Structure formats: C-alpha cells, structure tokens
Amino acid sequence: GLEERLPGGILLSTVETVAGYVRKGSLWPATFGLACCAIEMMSTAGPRFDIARFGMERFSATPRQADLMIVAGRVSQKMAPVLRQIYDQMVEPKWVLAMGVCASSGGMFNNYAVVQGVDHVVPVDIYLPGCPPRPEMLLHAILKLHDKIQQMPLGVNREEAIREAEQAALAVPPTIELKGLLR
Amino acid sequence: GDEPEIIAVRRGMFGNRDTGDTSGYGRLVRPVALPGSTPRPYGGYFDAVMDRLAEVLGEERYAMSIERVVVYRDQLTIEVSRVQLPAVASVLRDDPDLRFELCLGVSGVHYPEDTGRELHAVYPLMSITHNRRIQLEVAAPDADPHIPSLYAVYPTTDWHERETYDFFGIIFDGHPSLTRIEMPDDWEGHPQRKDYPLGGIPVEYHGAQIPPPDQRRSYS
Amino acid sequence: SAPLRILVYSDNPRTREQVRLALGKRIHPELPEIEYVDVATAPMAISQMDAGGFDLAILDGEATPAGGMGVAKQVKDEIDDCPPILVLTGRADDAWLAKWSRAEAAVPHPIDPIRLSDAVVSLLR
Amino acid sequence: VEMVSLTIDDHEISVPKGTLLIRAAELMGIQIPRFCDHPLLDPVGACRQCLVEVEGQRKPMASCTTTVMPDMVVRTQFTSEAADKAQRGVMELLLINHPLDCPICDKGGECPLQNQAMSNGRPETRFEDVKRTFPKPISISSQVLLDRERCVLCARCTRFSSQIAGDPFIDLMERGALQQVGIGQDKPFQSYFSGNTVQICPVGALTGTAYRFRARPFDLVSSPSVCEHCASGCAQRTDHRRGKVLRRLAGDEPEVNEEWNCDKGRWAFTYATVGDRITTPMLRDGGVLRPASWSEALTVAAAGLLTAAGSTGVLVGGRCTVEDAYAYAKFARMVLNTNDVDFRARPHSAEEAEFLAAHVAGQTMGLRYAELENAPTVLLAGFEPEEESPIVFLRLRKGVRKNGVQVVAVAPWASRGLTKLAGTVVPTVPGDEPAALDGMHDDDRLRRPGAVILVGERLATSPGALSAAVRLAAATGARLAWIPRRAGERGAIEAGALPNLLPGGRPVDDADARAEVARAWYISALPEAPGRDTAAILSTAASGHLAALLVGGVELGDLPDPELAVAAVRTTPFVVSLELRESAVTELADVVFPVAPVVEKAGSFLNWEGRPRPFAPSLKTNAIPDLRVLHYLADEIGVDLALPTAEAADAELAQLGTWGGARPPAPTAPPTARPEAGSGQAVLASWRMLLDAGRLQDGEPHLAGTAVRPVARMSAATAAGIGASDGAPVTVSTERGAVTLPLAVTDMPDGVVWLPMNSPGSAVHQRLGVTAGAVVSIGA
Amino acid sequence: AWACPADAIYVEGADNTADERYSPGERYGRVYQINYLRCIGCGLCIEACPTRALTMTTEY
Amino acid sequence: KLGPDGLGNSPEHIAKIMGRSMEGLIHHFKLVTEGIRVPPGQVYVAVESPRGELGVHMVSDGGTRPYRVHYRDPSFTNLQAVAATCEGGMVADAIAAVASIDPVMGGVDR
Ligand SMILES: CC(C)=CCC/C(C)=C\CC/C(C)=C/CC/C(C)=C\CC/C(C)=C/CC/C(C)=C/CC/C(C)=C/CC/C(C)=C/CC/C(C)=C/CC1=C(C)C(=O)c2ccccc2C1=O
Ligand SMILES: Nc1nc2c(ncn2[C@@H]2O[C@H](COP(=O)(O)OP(=O)(O)OP(=O)(O)O)[C@@H](O)[C@H]2O)c(=O)[nH]1
Ligand code: SF4
Ligand code: SF4
Ligand code: SF4
Ligand code: SF4
Ligand code: SF4
Ligand code: FES
C-alpha cells in the first residue's frame, strides 16, 4: 500500500509505530482450532481470563477478517492442505501462533500422521510450548507476538530489515552442531 | 485348531528382540500364545449364549461357523470362521434369546507372526435387552485379507470396516464403499500394520537428536 | 549460455552446503554453468522468487521457521511462471505433503548427491 | 543320538542325553533365573540361583549343573513352593551387599540382576545392616573397569578368560565375602578377548571404559552388523547414539562366532570419526587438494580415466565388501577394459593368485567353523589364528578342550595363541615352509578323516609354499582352507577382483568363461590380455608406463615395498581414490571420492569359510558406497555399470553363480631356494599383531593400550651371536631403514629374527621395505 | 529421559572426577536438554527421578 | 511430594531407593523405565463416557508395551448419525443436530 511508498523519514517511523500499535491491538484470531489446544483457547476467551482485554475477542469466523491464526492443536497430514488454504485465504499482514507442542513440533505424536510442526506448511511467528498451554501461557505468547508486531518495519525499512535478518540467519549454525559439553 | 494360538515367538530372556546385551541369556524360547479354547462349562451367561447359538445354528453349521470359544478375564470371545460371519451375526442379532442388537464397531489387529491368520477383526456386540455382551474374532491371512462385511446385519460397522481397512487393508468384501476414512485416498500403506514404520522424525537437540522410538532399542 | 541460477533455501547451512556439493558449477558438461543464491529465511526466498530469474529452487522441507513445502506452495500460488521447485523432505511419510506442495520433484533427507543431481537434471531438461 | 524323556513342571518333553535341566527349561519356555550358568561355559553351579525341585532329591538341584535323566520329574519356581522360596532367598542374599548404583550403573536397563530380581526377588529389603564395600571402579586394563561391589561372583568372566580364551589374567581372589575378581598386581588383563568379559558379566561389575556413562539402552539405536576387520565375519550388534557408535556387542551366530568377539571388532569402530575422514569429493587444483562438488569430481575423474584408456590399474584393497569388490572388478573390466585388478594390498605372489583361483575362488562352505571344532588334526601354515582371524582361534581352542583337536603349526616359534591351542610347532625358518609341508606327506595325523590344513595369507610370500600345501592336502586328503586377514579379501575373490579371475571363480584365461560373464553383463566381450597383479601394477606405474590408477582403500604402508608404492602413485599421471579416510594415496591423488564406512553402508562380506555375512546400514547418512561411486563414475564415462546399490550387485552375482566349469590348474610353483643369512644377519619372520598400527584401529587409545608389547624375538644362540641380551634393545636393519625393539629370547630356529609386522615402532614394511623371508642385518 | 513419552529430554552423563565434581557419586549429568516443543508436561520425568534432581515448578 | 524446589519424588522415597533398599531401587528403576509386563491376552473394556460407550480393545503380547490399543470412541459412531439428523432439515437445523451429537474430534480420529 501507499504506506509502503512513504519516505524513510520520521513520517515512515511514525506510520510504522502507529500501525504496530493498531495491529497489536485488535489482533483478531481466526475461528480455527484443531484439538484440546482449541479448548484451552476457548478457556482463554472464557471469563476466568479475558482474551477480550487485548482486543482479541472477535474470533474471525472467516479468514478474510482474521489477522492471527492460532493453530491451537495438532495438524494431521490430511489437514495440512486445509490449514494452508486457511492461511493463504487470510489477507496480509498475517501472523501464525503455533499453540501447543503438537502445533509447534508435533509434540508427543512423532509419527506418520502428524506434520511435526505447522512451520512445515505456514510461517510461524511464535512457538508456544505446553500440552496444552495454560491460558496464561497463551496470553504470554500473544503479548510476545504483540511486541513483535509493534516493532514490525514497513517499506524501505521492511526491505532493509529483511536483508539484515537474512544476513544474520545465513550464519547461524544448525542446532545439531551445538555440541557444547557433549562427550 | 484347538491348540493355543501363537501370535509371536519370543526367544531370549528379558524380552530382547535381537541378540541381547548380555551373553548367554538368549537361548530361551517362549512362544507368545493367546488364551486357547475354553473348557465347555463357560462362566456366567456365556454358557447360555453359546448353548442358544448352537441350538439356533445346526450342529453342522455351528461346527463350521464357530472356530473357537475363549473365556478370558470373564469376557467371552468367539473365534468365528471367515465366510460364516454374516450368518452368525444375523443369528446373534435376530435370535430373541441372543438379541445382540448393538454392535459397537470393528477393531483391526495385526499378528504378522500368526501364519494364515495375520489380520484379526474384533466385533464387540452387546445385547441391551439381556444386558449381555460378547466379542467375535474373525481371522484372515495377509495374502487374502478378505472378510464378509456385516453392513447388512450391523450398519454401524460402516466406517469401522473402513477405519480397520484404512489402517490394516482388511477388505471386508461386500461393504457398500470401502474407502479410506482416516488417511488420504492417495496414502500408500496401512499405518497400523506392524510392518508399517512409525514414520517419526528425530527430535532435535543442541548438538544431538533422538531417533523415533521405533528405531531405538526396546525390551518386551 | 546463461548461468542457470538456482535458489537453495534452508535455515540449515549444512543442507545448503550439501545441495551445492551435489550440484557443482555444472551438473553435466552439456548443461550450462550454475550460480547459487543462498537464502536462509522465507521472506528473502519469496522476494528473490518475485524478482525472478531463477531456473530452479531447492526448498528444504525441514526449514525451521517456514518449511520448504509451505514455501513451495506459496511460490507456485504467488509467482507467475515460477521455476520448477524441488523439495527436500525430512521423512518418507512427508512424500504425500511433497505431492501436495506441487513441487516438481522431492528428494528425501539425507540428501543423496546423485539422486539430487538426477532430479535437478530432469527438472532442467 | 540318545534322547531322554523328561517332565518339567506338569509338561513333558524329550531332549538329547546330557542336556542340562536349565537348557531343557529354556527349550520348553520356562524361565529359570540364572547368573553363573552360561551355555558356552562349562557349568559351575556357583550362584545357586537356578535351584529347582527334582523328585527323589532332598536338596534343591542347580538346574545349570543337573544333567537330564530319563523319567526325571522337575518342578521349577512356577510349580514348586520350595523351589520358589529357594530362588527368592538366593536373590535376597545376592542383593544384600549389592550397591544402590542402578541409576549410575552402566548395566542399568540391561542388567540380568535387575530383571531377575524383579521376576524372582522380594519387593523390598530385609537387610538393615552395613553393606560390604570396595573401592570402585578399578581398572583391570586400559579398556575394562571393574566394580567389585556389583560383582555377584558368578565367575562368568573368569570362566570365560580360562575356558574360552586361554588368558586367565583375571581370577577370583581373596576368600569368603572378601572374594573378588582381580588381576593380583599391576599386570593388566591383557587378552584380545577382554571385551567379552564385559558382555558376559550379568551385572555392572565389568564395564567397558569406552562405553562408560555414554548411554542407556532406551536411547541406543541397535543394528545387526558384521565385523569389518578379520575374515572371521563375526555377527555383531552395533549400538549408536546421536549418530555415533558407542559399542559393538558379540551378537549370536552359533555357526560363526557363537557369542564372542575379539577386542578389535568390539572397540575398533572409532576410525571413521578421528577427523581424517574425507567428507566431500576432492580435486587436485594448483597442487593442493581442494574440496570439489560431486559433479565436478566425477567429470574430472571420467575425463582422466578416458584419457588413460587401457593403461590403468585398479587397486581394490581388502576392505571392500563383496558387492564393492564386484563393482571394482566390473568397472575395471567393462569401463576401463583392463584386467589389472588386484585386491591384495599386502605381501603377495602370482602363485598366490593361481592358488586362489584353483582352490578358493568359486568354492564356498567347503570348510566351516563347525568342522574345525571336530577336525582331529589341524595344521596351521603361515597362519596365526589369534593374530589373524581370532574366532578361528576360539573355535580351535573349543575343539581342543572338547573334541581333543590336535593342532600343528609350521611357524618359526610358538605364539601365545598356539600355546593356548596346545599346538605343536614344527620349527621352520620363514621361506622354508614348502620343505616342511612336503615333509608331512607321511604324517598319520593328517590321514585321519576330517583333518584340516589352514593356510594364512602369509604363505603367499613364501615361493612354492601354497603349492606345497595343495600337494599336502591332496596326498593326505585333509581339507585345505585359506584364511586371509581382511574381511573383504575372500569377498574380493568371489567378486573376481584378481588379474586372472572373473566373478564366481571364473578364470580369465577361458574363452567360455569370458563369454558367459560378458553375456551376463550385456557387453560385447571382456578384456583378454592377462592382468597385472598389485606388485606388477605398482612396478609399471613407478616406471611411468601406467597412465592412471584407481586405488580403493589401500594402505600403501601395508604393501611389501611402500616406497615403491608411493613412487608409483606419485609418478602416475592420474590417480583416483575411493577412500574413507585421509591417507597417503589421498595426499597424492588427483581425484578423491568419499565412500561410506561399513556402519553407513549396506553390503555383505565373505568370511574365510565363504559364508555370506550380510548387513544393512546402521547409520542413515548421505555417504554412499564404493558401489555407487563406481556406478556413477562409469555413467559419467558413459557406461551403465548397472550397480546402483548393493542389492543390485548381490542380485547380479547370484545370477552369475559359480563358474562350475573347468577348474584352473593348481599353482605347482617350484620351491625356490631360500636366501642364506650370513654373520650379523638373520631371516626376517613377521606377522601382523591383532592390535597394531592398523588404520581402522585409530581413534581408540584404550584398545591400542591393550596391544601386546612389540618385541623383536630371537633364538638364544642368535642373540648371543649378535651380542644382545634378553630385554635389551636390538636393531634390525636393511638398506631402507631400521627397526629397534626390546629383545625377547624365544627358542626360535637359529638365524631367524621375528618382528611384529605393523606394531607401533616396528612398521616393518615402511621401515625396512622387506617382508617375511628377507635377510635383515642384526645388531645390539 | 527414559520415562519421557515424548522423548523431550536429552541427558548425557559423565564422571565426577576429583578435579571437577558436580554431583555426589560417580556420575553427573553434564548435558541436560529439555525440548519444550516436545514436552507434554506429563510429569513422568520427575516421578522417574531417583534423586529429586528434577522437579517441576509453578513457573509457566 | 511438594517442597520449596517444586514437585518431585518425595525425600522419603529418595532415601528409601538411593540409601537403604536395593530391592526398592531395582523396582523403581524397572517400573519407571520398562514398566510392568502385562500377560498376553485380549480384553474389551467399556465405560460410559459423556458421549456414550467409550470402548477399548486392548491386546497384550506379554511385553512391556501394549501390542494393540483401539478406542471405540462414541463420537466416531455417533457421527454416523449426522446423515440421519441433518438430511431434510435446514443448515441451521444441521448445526443444532451436529452440536447435539456433541462430537469431540480427537476421539473421532485418534
Ligand atoms: C474508513 C475509516 C478508517 C474511517 C474513520 C473512522 C473509523 C476509524 C471507523 C469507524 C468505526 C469502525 C467502522 C470500526 C471498525 C471495527 C468494526 C466496524 C467492528 C469490528 C469489531 C466488533 C464487530 C466487535 C464485536 C465483535 C464481538 C461481539 C466479538 C466476540 C466474539 C466471541 C464471543 C468470540 C469467542 C469465540 C471463541 C470461543 C473462540 C474459539 C474458537 C475455536 C476454539 C475454534 C476451534 C474449535 C471450535 C470452533 C469448537 O467449538 C470446538 C468445540 C469442542 C472441541 C474443539 C473445538 C474446536 O477445535
Ligand atoms: N574404498 C574403501 N576404503 C575403505 C573402506 N573401509 C576402509 N577404507 C580405507 O582403506 C584404507 C586401508 O585400510 P586397511 O588396508 O584395512 O588398513 P588397516 O585399517 O590398518 O587394516 P589392516 O588390513 O589390518 O591393515 C584405510 O585408510 C581406510 O580409510 C571401504 O569400505 N571402502
Ligand atoms: S499440544 Fe497437547 S493439548 Fe495441544 S493438540 Fe497436541 S496433544 Fe492436544
Ligand atoms: S549391576 Fe544391575 S542391580 Fe547392580 S547397580 Fe547396576 S543395574 Fe543396578
Ligand atoms: S565380574 Fe561379572 S562375570 Fe565376573 S564374577 Fe563378577 S559378576 Fe560374574
Ligand atoms: S575375530 Fe576378526 S571378525 Fe571377529 S570380532 Fe575380532 S576382528 Fe572382528
Ligand atoms: S513433563 Fe517431563 S517427562 Fe513429561 S514430557 Fe515433559 S520433560 Fe518429558
Ligand atoms: S546358574 Fe546354576 S547355580 Fe548359578
């Protein structure tokens, strides 16, 4: 959008900060949930907690209105195409919260049927441990995503950030090479 | 028949599936037999159920249909010969004294070491009227994994014959449409067969990874 | 001839090194020289694909923040006349998803140099 | 065989006469607890854990010692309260002094004591007193730690070190509750079979220092395997964690090794991870060896080989699997159209090739371990069973102890292995072996049915020795078996990786054989020109008449003249290496291809008895076998080798089958006169120690520390004539160099000096450039 | 790690040499990793520990 | 048991297994690592889950792991009533019918 054509002066910085504040608030989750993690997501929406306090009570039934896709449960092989379709049918900017161990790495179900982490099919922004994560853990992960969204760049700043993140990522060794103290 | 049904031959102490960690303990040979034919005075109402089934079915038909009778942990299993399954199922459902109207489903179990009887289908039946229950067991070889579908007798077996097929390849001949219900139709293999690998991935760690449990050593 | 440009996408630098080792400067002396563009992050890979000028993309299905299969589906849905996609699968059971990603070819981990080279030749031929 | 009926519990079975009650229960599926019992050890009845109730016996009977007798009635713990009480009391007594070390014990999870205390022990302790204690752990060798507190004094370790291996360097010591397995003093355990004691201990008393605290069973990936090192082909179980092999247990192959290993097979698995492994293809650029892509390396290698057309030699080495050696031979004959193929990376002779073609190639299972144990007489020629093929030594010792096998060795001196076999030496200076073999045509011992003659590879170094052995076998009728040192040599022979041989024992010099193999290969015709052996190839290349070399897994230092070998590879215009490790060939090669180690590759070996020893890969890795490297190198060259995998090579070999036609003539080489050593000189005898400077033994300091002390062995008269004294350093020398080792007076034939062929500080081939049978100057 | 249903714990023991001792006795866990993207919080690990070296806090 | 360091094996149990009881230590180790061994056999056991008869066919081959464990989950069978309870009515009625079936899909698929 034209907000991405703005010059990199103070104008772009203020547009970025206001857009981040606006998007961190009103972060409507998609009406999407796979398993017991979906039950904990509902509990988070439930009175004991209040997802609504964060402007996130409107679980967008359609992906068009959804801004955040809380996977919230295990993703089977047959479901990955559906989850990717839902992700693609959301409109940018989009974010994916991998709620629970099943959504983030497959969790305990390390077998043929489970995808072993939704990042196999959709870009994940935050991983949320737990099986299921208790609602406070979900709110913590959501606030972490809010912090990430606030510092989200735009336009030329976005391009520079992408280049810098690429440069940093090209150098990190794989986890299999962090042999610290391994005999 | 009439002999114990060995589903696996376990050799070596401590449940080693291979040569074994300590020398000299691998020479034991213990066949793993499931409970065999029960002596005739079955417990509780099992005696009445079997007597009624043998009365409704002709002596010849009963002998041809009922391959075995087992009473294990106060639960009655009837090893029903393949082919004859629909007839005995109809008798069980319709006979007023049996009246096993509620079929709870079909469960597949794979015995890769049970020659000629690798694939077993288990039919848990319950009679609400008599507050009774039994299980039927139908064995089929891995070479011809065909069983008569009970769709006409127990429509509830629909999707079960499918799940059991999807996960074992039992063909349940005569089923209206035996299509995969859990796995995708393009899926290759039948996951719950023992020969089908678990299909996991190594768990990632800093400097190391743990292979899936099916690859790592186990004792049974 | 035009140096065929290949996009190698993987958060794991060692997977990129193995892919570049299987495919030398020339897969065969009959084929053109090969230039490799390494991308570790999905945003960079997507932007490079949008810039175009690639003859093949090798996407690691095991990439941590964004899997190669997802990126393959995204590029084949988002870039017009996108180049053939080769996906590296972390397990055999991933084959189904590899088919879903519509990748022209799938090469299981660990990357067999010869299998990868043959698949690349088939895709470029 | 006599058969006796018997009743265990309520069930009845029949078993061979002489069977032990515990064995009968095993066959019947009854699990009687046991610690001291071992099927392969003579029963001792120590631990008293295996007590059962026998009708007509007042006391409980140790089933591990009670032979089955007809009509005997036995009730185990499953059907006899007295037997169960006895067994559980024995278990309680076994656990009172045991340390609460299960979490820290290496045997945890795999402990027979844990399992049998669960299945036959009290739920909780009654022992509220003070436990007996020892300092723990104490090293009895560089490899084996001993935790005397966990020791149940089952004596399995000691009984193994005495009966199975003739190395009783551990024994039960002290008395009563203080009794403990020990070595007595600083003298280490020091046997090639020490690791077996670790695998035979039913508790965490004996543990391998290498495997210490590195894993518990649940996280081990365990795969069946075959040992790479000797031609014994032991079945093994390779256990690896996070992609690193931690140990290799003995497996269970009654027809090969039963439940035993040598230390080499158990612990020599670190060679592939010492840092010298070649990880990527390499190319010679600017005189330096640079990492190169597979495509570029294959292209360069194909270009060089095509530019070298027929002027190429293929050194296959002895490490390749049967499939790998078959691929080397097929590449050489189909792709390079040359017969210059030789797996012998070691002292060898053309007479050796003729003998292998005549009597070895294409003839499998002619002799078997089971026959060694029963052979009334076994004659060892140029063979040291303990140093080469240790499981052959174990089987021979088992035969000696059980069936009274008589062992004779035509060797310069009695090695410890021969003494442990109770073998009688026929003292012969090396090179004089043919005279001794011809001098035994009248030996009544060899006439006896089942008599066997085991010939080591080293007889190839003695002219006419193999012909003499063949004549001796023909005259006496004793079956003759050839036992190499490397696992891949017999597979190489079956693969036809020799200048005069084709796959399946098919002779090259036979138009029908060439036509048959070519038809099986879908090729016009195979090369007919006679092939040059390893020595001929090296001499030609050094002279500059060889355009290129294909060297696979060859240790140049192991060749009789390593200086010649290095000169040959250096002068060869183009050298292609298929090497797992950085090596001397790699330092001088133009193209280097990494090849998967055995643990990462599917394949099969052939042990000396020709038995197939298959194995699937244990580690899934991107590394590829020599098979695929050669196949795709040929494809780049433009010839479809049709060997994409070990399965394809095995199928092709099976399709070819054995030759089955006219057997090649026997060598019949003449017994060339042996050199005469003058004053200050002696004839050199030597064989390779089991644990020496071998490359595959690298990366395992403990195993190397277990190696026998290198010593130059001389007759007393010769040492006196050289001015040396027992234990004093002695130097043997040639024009190339010298080897200095402590002297050992050994009662050898006069004028013969024996050295370890490749022990550290000896390296006879490298340091002297000569092999066994040569004359070497001696000095104090 | 043995009892973990999800293989979420990786542990490597090592000797408590007199020069560097980390725990009483002969062995200590020098490498100890929990993959919290595989942890299911079942608590089998703590029930498995024979030393109470592993507990589970209320921090989430 | 709970303590200032959180939830973990009670100090009394630690003392029993690591300090005084060898049999106790062996039992803890084995029952935690391999677990119990279940004699071979088949058993079908059913309970009244909130959604109906939750049945479990459990087959043991004598080992420390369940040879076969199949859940007859009531939701799986109940979902076969969607055709009966939805055909003929409106989509708004189908929503109510499916909700009344109260299917929890974890039990349905397993
Ligand atoms: C143009 C311009 C800028 C002009 C200037 C002026 C200006 C700024 C604008 C003027 C004002 C305007 C137009 C403002 C824009 C905003 C606007 C118009 C409106 C949007 C805001 C709005 C409509 C607010 C109210 C919405 C609202 C009432 C929200 C509450 C919704 C609720 C109750 C949500 C909770 C839903 C919930 C429990 C979620 C869980 C979903 C789950 C778990 C899914 C998965 C799942 C399910 C669904 C199960 O039920 C389930 C059951 C059993 C087992 C498993 C599962 C399972 O897996
Ligand atoms: N091509 C190929 N090379 C191998 C293979 N296995 C080992 N090698 C290499 O071959 C070289 C020679 O090994 P060997 O001839 O067995 O020497 P060694 O390791 O000391 O063993 P010995 O035969 O007792 O001398 C070593 O440097 C290894 O790196 C293999 O499977 N294929
Ligand atoms: S992470 Fe746990 S709670 Fe969430 S879906 Fe997976 S198993 Fe269910
Ligand atoms: S030897 Fe067995 S009983 Fe003794 S501490 Fe080790 S695992 Fe425990
Ligand atoms: S060290 Fe092991 S094998 Fe030897 S006596 Fe003790 S418990 Fe038995
Ligand atoms: S005898 Fe030979 S084959 Fe057997 S374990 Fe020892 S080195 Fe390996
Ligand atoms: S809570 Fe402990 S035992 Fe359970 S999964 Fe997590 S790490 Fe493993
Ligand atoms: S095993 Fe027989 S007394 Fe020890």
PDB file of N, CA and C in Angstrom, chain D residues 228-231 315-322 325 342-346 484-492 552-555 558 605-606 696:
ATOM      1  N   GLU D 228      34.250 -55.620  10.329  1.00  0.00           N
ATOM      2  CA  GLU D 228      34.972 -55.253   9.120  1.00  0.00           C
ATOM      3  C   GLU D 228      36.380 -55.818   9.074  1.00  0.00           C
ATOM      4  N   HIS D 229      36.958 -56.168  10.220  1.00  0.00           N
ATOM      5  CA  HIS D 229      38.403 -56.311  10.316  1.00  0.00           C
ATOM      6  C   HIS D 229      38.905 -57.664   9.833  1.00  0.00           C
ATOM      7  N   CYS D 230      38.517 -58.745  10.502  1.00  0.00           N
ATOM      8  CA  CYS D 230      39.057 -60.049  10.156  1.00  0.00           C
ATOM      9  C   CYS D 230      38.172 -60.748   9.138  1.00  0.00           C
ATOM     10  N   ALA D 231      38.672 -61.858   8.634  1.00  0.00           N
ATOM     11  CA  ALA D 231      37.902 -62.715   7.755  1.00  0.00           C
ATOM     12  C   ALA D 231      37.014 -63.641   8.509  1.00  0.00           C
ATOM     13  N   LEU D 315      43.590 -50.855  -7.933  1.00  0.00           N
ATOM     14  CA  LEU D 315      43.941 -51.462  -6.654  1.00  0.00           C
ATOM     15  C   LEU D 315      42.721 -51.389  -5.746  1.00  0.00           C
ATOM     16  N   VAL D 316      42.134 -52.546  -5.444  1.00  0.00           N
ATOM     17  CA  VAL D 316      40.860 -52.576  -4.740  1.00  0.00           C
ATOM     18  C   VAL D 316      41.009 -52.614  -3.224  1.00  0.00           C
ATOM     19  N   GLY D 317      42.128 -53.113  -2.709  1.00  0.00           N
ATOM     20  CA  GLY D 317      42.279 -53.244  -1.274  1.00  0.00           C
ATOM     21  C   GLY D 317      41.427 -54.370  -0.728  1.00  0.00           C
ATOM     22  N   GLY D 318      41.611 -54.708   0.542  1.00  0.00           N
ATOM     23  CA  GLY D 318      40.898 -55.804   1.159  1.00  0.00           C
ATOM     24  C   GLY D 318      39.727 -55.412   2.029  1.00  0.00           C
ATOM     25  N   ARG D 319      39.391 -54.128   2.108  1.00  0.00           N
ATOM     26  CA  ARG D 319      38.311 -53.667   2.967  1.00  0.00           C
ATOM     27  C   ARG D 319      36.953 -53.674   2.285  1.00  0.00           C
ATOM     28  N   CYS D 320      36.914 -53.717   0.960  1.00  0.00           N
ATOM     29  CA  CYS D 320      35.652 -53.600   0.247  1.00  0.00           C
ATOM     30  C   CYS D 320      34.767 -54.812   0.498  1.00  0.00           C
ATOM     31  N   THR D 321      33.460 -54.573   0.543  1.00  0.00           N
ATOM     32  CA  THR D 321      32.506 -55.664   0.647  1.00  0.00           C
ATOM     33  C   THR D 321      32.485 -56.455  -0.652  1.00  0.00           C
ATOM     34  N   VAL D 322      31.797 -57.593  -0.628  1.00  0.00           N
ATOM     35  CA  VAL D 322      31.724 -58.447  -1.805  1.00  0.00           C
ATOM     36  C   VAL D 322      31.107 -57.641  -2.937  1.00  0.00           C
ATOM     37  N   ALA D 325      33.733 -54.986  -4.056  1.00  0.00           N
ATOM     38  CA  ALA D 325      34.791 -55.586  -4.861  1.00  0.00           C
ATOM     39  C   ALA D 325      34.270 -55.983  -6.232  1.00  0.00           C
ATOM     40  N   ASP D 342      43.446 -55.922  -8.657  1.00  0.00           N
ATOM     41  CA  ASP D 342      44.036 -56.699  -7.578  1.00  0.00           C
ATOM     42  C   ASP D 342      43.637 -56.107  -6.238  1.00  0.00           C
ATOM     43  N   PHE D 343      43.052 -56.943  -5.383  1.00  0.00           N
ATOM     44  CA  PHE D 343      42.679 -56.521  -4.041  1.00  0.00           C
ATOM     45  C   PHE D 343      43.814 -56.679  -3.042  1.00  0.00           C
ATOM     46  N   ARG D 344      44.893 -57.362  -3.419  1.00  0.00           N
ATOM     47  CA  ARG D 344      45.977 -57.639  -2.487  1.00  0.00           C
ATOM     48  C   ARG D 344      46.801 -56.390  -2.213  1.00  0.00           C
ATOM     49  N   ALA D 345      46.458 -55.665  -1.152  1.00  0.00           N
ATOM     50  CA  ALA D 345      47.265 -54.541  -0.677  1.00  0.00           C
ATOM     51  C   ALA D 345      48.207 -54.987   0.434  1.00  0.00           C
ATOM     52  N   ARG D 346      49.050 -55.960   0.121  1.00  0.00           N
ATOM     53  CA  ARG D 346      49.868 -56.631   1.119  1.00  0.00           C
ATOM     54  C   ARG D 346      50.814 -57.607   0.434  1.00  0.00           C
ATOM     55  N   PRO D 484      42.371 -65.479   5.069  1.00  0.00           N
ATOM     56  CA  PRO D 484      43.049 -64.180   4.991  1.00  0.00           C
ATOM     57  C   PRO D 484      42.922 -63.386   6.277  1.00  0.00           C
ATOM     58  N   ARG D 485      43.433 -62.157   6.277  1.00  0.00           N
ATOM     59  CA  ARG D 485      43.329 -61.284   7.436  1.00  0.00           C
ATOM     60  C   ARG D 485      42.227 -60.246   7.320  1.00  0.00           C
ATOM     61  N   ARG D 486      41.920 -59.773   6.119  1.00  0.00           N
ATOM     62  CA  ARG D 486      40.958 -58.697   5.936  1.00  0.00           C
ATOM     63  C   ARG D 486      39.621 -59.270   5.490  1.00  0.00           C
ATOM     64  N   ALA D 487      38.539 -58.666   5.981  1.00  0.00           N
ATOM     65  CA  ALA D 487      37.214 -59.224   5.747  1.00  0.00           C
ATOM     66  C   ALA D 487      36.860 -59.243   4.268  1.00  0.00           C
ATOM     67  N   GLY D 488      37.398 -58.309   3.490  1.00  0.00           N
ATOM     68  CA  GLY D 488      36.996 -58.191   2.102  1.00  0.00           C
ATOM     69  C   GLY D 488      37.795 -59.007   1.113  1.00  0.00           C
ATOM     70  N   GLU D 489      38.826 -59.727   1.558  1.00  0.00           N
ATOM     71  CA  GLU D 489      39.673 -60.438   0.607  1.00  0.00           C
ATOM     72  C   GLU D 489      38.942 -61.623  -0.010  1.00  0.00           C
ATOM     73  N   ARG D 490      38.274 -62.432   0.813  1.00  0.00           N
ATOM     74  CA  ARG D 490      37.523 -63.548   0.251  1.00  0.00           C
ATOM     75  C   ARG D 490      36.353 -63.060  -0.591  1.00  0.00           C
ATOM     76  N   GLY D 491      35.654 -62.023  -0.133  1.00  0.00           N
ATOM     77  CA  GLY D 491      34.627 -61.422  -0.965  1.00  0.00           C
ATOM     78  C   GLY D 491      35.192 -60.893  -2.266  1.00  0.00           C
ATOM     79  N   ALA D 492      36.391 -60.311  -2.206  1.00  0.00           N
ATOM     80  CA  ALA D 492      37.045 -59.854  -3.425  1.00  0.00           C
ATOM     81  C   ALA D 492      37.312 -61.011  -4.373  1.00  0.00           C
ATOM     82  N   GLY D 552      41.336 -48.024  -4.307  1.00  0.00           N
ATOM     83  CA  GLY D 552      40.262 -48.026  -3.335  1.00  0.00           C
ATOM     84  C   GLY D 552      40.664 -48.617  -2.000  1.00  0.00           C
ATOM     85  N   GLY D 553      40.777 -47.774  -0.978  1.00  0.00           N
ATOM     86  CA  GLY D 553      41.005 -48.258   0.368  1.00  0.00           C
ATOM     87  C   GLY D 553      42.269 -49.076   0.513  1.00  0.00           C
ATOM     88  N   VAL D 554      43.380 -48.569  -0.010  1.00  0.00           N
ATOM     89  CA  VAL D 554      44.668 -49.248   0.055  1.00  0.00           C
ATOM     90  C   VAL D 554      45.574 -48.473   0.997  1.00  0.00           C
ATOM     91  N   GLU D 555      46.141 -49.174   1.972  1.00  0.00           N
ATOM     92  CA  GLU D 555      47.141 -48.607   2.867  1.00  0.00           C
ATOM     93  C   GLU D 555      48.512 -48.885   2.264  1.00  0.00           C
ATOM     94  N   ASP D 558      51.091 -50.923   4.010  1.00  0.00           N
ATOM     95  CA  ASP D 558      50.898 -52.359   4.141  1.00  0.00           C
ATOM     96  C   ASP D 558      51.490 -53.151   2.984  1.00  0.00           C
ATOM     97  N   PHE D 605      29.986 -59.282   3.561  1.00  0.00           N
ATOM     98  CA  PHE D 605      31.326 -59.831   3.478  1.00  0.00           C
ATOM     99  C   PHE D 605      31.261 -61.327   3.196  1.00  0.00           C
ATOM    100  N   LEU D 606      32.408 -61.895   2.850  1.00  0.00           N
ATOM    101  CA  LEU D 606      32.592 -63.338   2.827  1.00  0.00           C
ATOM    102  C   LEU D 606      33.720 -63.692   3.778  1.00  0.00           C
ATOM    103  N   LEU D 696      42.314 -48.863  10.778  1.00  0.00           N
ATOM    104  CA  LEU D 696      40.979 -48.968  11.350  1.00  0.00           C
ATOM    105  C   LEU D 696      40.998 -49.041  12.869  1.00  0.00           C
TER     106      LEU D 696
END
